[PDB]
Amino acid sequence: ENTQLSEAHVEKSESCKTEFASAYRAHTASASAKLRVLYQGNNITVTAY
């Protein structure tokens, strides 16, 4: 008439703040590029969306 109650569950490990993977929904990529332009014998840098 002696019984043993076994209990178990699965929460985030202490490592979750350091070792983790992120699941993202990627949509509509924004293209950017700085175009070096040889303008009037000099190189000019243009950074635009």
Binding site: S13, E14, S15, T18, E19
Partner: protein
Amino acid sequence: VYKATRPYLAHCPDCGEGHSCHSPVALERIRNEATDGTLKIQVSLQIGIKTDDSHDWTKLRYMDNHMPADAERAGLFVRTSAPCTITGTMGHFILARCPKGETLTVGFTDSRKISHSCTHPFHHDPPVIGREKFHSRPQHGKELPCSTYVQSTAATTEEIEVHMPPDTPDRTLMSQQSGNVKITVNGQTVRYKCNCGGSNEGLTTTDKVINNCKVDQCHAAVTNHKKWQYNSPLVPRNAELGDRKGKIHIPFPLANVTCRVPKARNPTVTYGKNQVIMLLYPDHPTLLSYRNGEEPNYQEEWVMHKKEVVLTVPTEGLEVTWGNNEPYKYWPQL
């Protein structure tokens, strides 16, 4: 925190020669989340703390049957297939760098010698950090992100659950007076159960007598209530109190660090029509990886000895990585 906590005896499947015992060096949990190969081992005893609660790195405290006793830290050992290199010890925790194995053993020496060890089945074969399988850690090399359990004594982030003890069985607590059962507490908390009527419960802080009962029909065990113990699945829960829990910070938490590595030699390169030929001469196992455009078609192989590799170079280009070296880029001529 060690004034409230205590070392304990818990179930171990192998105390030596495949035989189970109530071990003072019982294994609780082996953590292997560190990419650098470091193992965070949890044990039933407490390292670096004496019986009087004082901190002493040369000492170790374990549960010696009824009461805790002092042991030497030098006698503490960790082994898999061969001995391990212990990198840090504090309380229930051990940090170790172990060779490839299928079991994990943690042991020590008492006062009257007598070696106590606990063997658990554990597959240890740590994965390679980087693209080169090396033996010793270098001073200079490529800085790659890796995780480790910090050598620091300080306990500020990670934690474990603690609660009031369970029960150490002791038949010396009971005697026959004169043909009845006498339970002498001796200034302790004793949990008793008798196969007789009247009173057979508790958890008592005072002496109890069971009239017209036999000593063989009774069970006695030393509790406690004044101390804390890790919420161990190898030790029973306290029946009297409900789901009463406590929590304490633990040493050596996992953190993001940097691991140093080395590099290999540049192979003798020969070119052909839309193809590259490399004569690889590795001194140790070296990872060889390559990719193309829209279809990269990633391929990898560990190069052990002298091997000639013929790779097709498409119009879009081919990127080749040979061990810890920076990737080589190849393009065909128009």
